[PDB]
Design a protein around this motif. Sequence first.
Motif, mmCIF file in Angstrom:
data_model
loop_
_atom_site.group_PDB
_atom_site.id
_atom_site.type_symbol
_atom_site.label_atom_id
_atom_site.label_comp_id
_atom_site.label_asym_id
_atom_site.label_seq_id
_atom_site.Cartn_x
_atom_site.Cartn_y
_atom_site.Cartn_z
ATOM 1 N N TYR A 90 -2.105 1.903 -4.806
ATOM 2 C CA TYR A 90 -1.204 0.734 -4.583
ATOM 3 C C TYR A 90 -1.260 -0.059 -3.098
ATOM 4 C CZ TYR A 90 1.060 1.233 -9.039
ATOM 5 O OH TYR A 90 1.555 1.258 -10.601
ATOM 6 N N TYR A 92 1.230 -3.316 -0.996
ATOM 7 C CA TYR A 92 2.015 -4.214 -0.619
ATOM 8 C C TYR A 92 2.023 -4.995 0.741
ATOM 9 C CZ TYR A 92 6.411 -6.617 -0.098
ATOM 10 O OH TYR A 92 7.589 -7.719 0.064
ATOM 11 N N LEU A 106 7.609 -3.467 -5.451
ATOM 12 C CA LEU A 106 6.996 -4.370 -4.724
ATOM 13 C C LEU A 106 5.349 -4.229 -4.788
ATOM 14 C CD1 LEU A 106 9.318 -4.913 -1.980
ATOM 15 C CD2 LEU A 106 9.039 -6.525 -3.762
ATOM 16 N N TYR A 107 5.010 -2.885 -4.994
ATOM 17 C CA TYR A 107 3.633 -2.542 -4.640
ATOM 18 C C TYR A 107 2.668 -2.887 -6.204
ATOM 19 C CZ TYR A 107 4.924 -0.028 -0.584
ATOM 20 O OH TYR A 107 5.485 0.176 0.404
#
Length: 159
Positions: A90, A92, A106-107
């Motif tokens: 992942y 962000y 959020l990722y």
Amino acid sequence: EVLLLDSKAEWISSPPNGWEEISGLDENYTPIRTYQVCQVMEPNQNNWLRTNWISKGNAQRIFVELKFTLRDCNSLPGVLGTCKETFNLYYYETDYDTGRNIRENLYVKIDTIAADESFTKLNTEVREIGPLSKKGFYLAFQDVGACIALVSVKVYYKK
């Protein structure tokens, strides 16, 4: 060519009991910092590991290299059930280092990460991301019930 992050040159665990840092030394006494998790006998694993904030510098396209070991669920002593042979990568994007909290929602998923085929040891997987719109970014690794040693993370760009 230009390194943005080199884990061979502590990161956040959520929960702290999931991914754990385990250290050693090279043949030439260079520190080895690994992050390991093997909760293969406990259901509903959601173990997150997040790097430090990474400045993108003058990068456009960015490469992420992971080196890891990953046990075949067949080799683990009668674990059965919900054992996995992959983990999730992942990221962000943020303009600044926002602190030590991992807000998982959020990722954005880059990819599923798998070991080399073994039915015929140290795996190397590269992903290309970007261009990024923000000044920097965090990388994160989500384990969902596998037996993983994450041995190194390098982030770099070219030309």
